[PDB]
Amino acid sequence: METVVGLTAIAVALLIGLGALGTAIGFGLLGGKFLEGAARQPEMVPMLQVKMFIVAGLLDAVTMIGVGIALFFTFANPFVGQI
């Protein structure tokens, strides 16, 4: 059983770590263009800020599926139930 429990810790670390890595780079790319658009057209800032949040909901999709499954594997375990 110890190998299943031990590998579940690494499964959780990869599932949250790759999600954090992609999220931080993704918002750096998206947010960087938001600051440039804000500097080009100061009057468009409130329209661009709303459009940034609309894009954020797609960018941050699979990362939350991973964070949810990873936290589930810490307080519950579907692999240990298979012996």
């Binding site: 999709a61 939350m64 949810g68 589930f72």
Partner: peptide, 13 residues
């Protein structure tokens, strides 16, 4: 489904 399931699952946790 992924976005909605992640929505309820993050609030539940």
């Amino acid at each position: 489904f992924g976005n909605m399931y992640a929505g309820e699952l993050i609030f539940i946790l």
